[model samples]
Target: GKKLLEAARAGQDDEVRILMANGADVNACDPSGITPLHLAADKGHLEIVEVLLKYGADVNAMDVWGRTPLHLAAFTGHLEIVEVLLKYGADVNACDLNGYTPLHLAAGRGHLEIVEVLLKNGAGVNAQDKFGKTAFDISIDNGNEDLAEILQSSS
Candidate 1:
């Protein structure tokens, strides 16, 4: 229901639990196809993310842009949520509609720690996006020297 999505997006953990118990679809998506897990991860609500995953939320569910929870976590710099999504089998190399992977977003945003975690989880450092730019390329374009070095090491 919308309440479940609202609760997840709002970081209302207790409300999420109650909704789930009352048979709310754990994978419910909003008009934009953004699921509860997607909203939770994007909002950095780790508890809500965990609860949604426990309830069988689609770990790899993609929004309209093909952005999964892992992509959201990485782009938003939610390191803990990134680790948790990986633990639950999130595709480290998943590409968005623009072919931007979690690594690409992390590197582009200069999220060094998230980039390191993604690399350790086997994210493809050389994977090119729709623009034919790899994570390394994004890092350099963004002037993120640290992220560039880490991505280079993994390549």
Candidate 2:
């Protein structure tokens, strides 16, 4: 699991394929509960992500922090990875341990395009986290007034 995870994280496509062909579990998780899909997607390794997905990796697989691959990709500003995850049926409005959705993460990090994508996919701007704060609230806190305004308008 560790080596496969490392290969996926490093974008070593051939190593990943070799590992997978040797009976590696595509769904193997890290101690933090992050799977190969999470690592590949988080790092923007689109091809690695695709291969793992082809091997039956759970796109919606959650980490110990309750963050799905969608959350990781969105938080990291990986547009293509996020798009692929969506195509794989990732929960567009999935909440993590802190109740932070991909929308909240993208808006908080000032990833405006991702925020729009999430919104376009039907994410609720007013959805609250564990702290009772919406993505708009996070945008405000993060000094992204533009994002806040868009979220407010969308709501």
Candidate 3:
């Protein structure tokens, strides 16, 4: 499992194929509830994500923090991965265990590109998290003055 996990993390397609051919479980979760798809998405490995999805990996699977691959991709500004996940039915507005949506994550991280993508996909800009903090609030709290300004003006 560890080997397959690492191979996916490193985006080694051939190694991933070999492991899967050897009967490795694609849905295997790590100690942190992070699956291979999570690692691949976090690392911006678009090809790896495509391969995992093709092999029946769950695109909406959440991690220990209740963050889906879409959350990771949005937070890290992986635009391509975000698009791929969206194409595969990833919930663009998915909230974590904290109820912070992908829009909140992207805004907090100051990922402008991702913010645009999420908005284009109909993400709720005013949605609040468990803390009652909306994406605008998270951006402000993170000192993203520019984002706060943009969101404020847009709303």
Sliding window of 10 residues with minimal summed lDDT for model 2: 84-93
lDDT of 2 by residue, 1-155 (tens): 78899898899999988989999887898788878888887889989988888767887788778878888888888878877767777787777778888888887788888887777778887788899988877876778767877877887
Model 1, stretches more than 4 Å misplaced?
Answer: none
In model 2, where do residues sit more than 4 Å from their true spots?
A: none
lDDT of each: 0.82, 0.82, 0.82
Cα-based lDDT at residue 79, candidate 2 = 77
Per-residue lDDT of 115 in model 3: 77
Among all candidates shown, the one with the greatest TM-score: 1
lDDT of 3: 0.82
Predictions ranked by TM-score, top down? 1, 2, 3
lDDT of 3 by residue, 14-121 (tens): 888888889888888888888888899889888888888887888888778887888878778787988877777777666777898888887877988787777777
* Per-candidate total of colliding backbone pairs: 0, 0, 0
Task: Tell me the deviation in Å of residue 59 in model 3.
Answer: 0.6
Q: Point out the worst 10-residue segment of candidate 1 by lDDT.
A: 146-155
Cα misplacement distance, residue 143 of candidate 2 (Å) = 2.1
Q: Which stretches of candidate 3 lie over 4 Å from their true place?
A: 143-145, 149-154
lDDT of 1 by residue, 1-155 (tens): 87888888788878877879998777779889998888888899988878878867899898788888888888888979988888888887677779888888887778888877877788787898888988777866787777677766666
Clashing pairs in 3: none
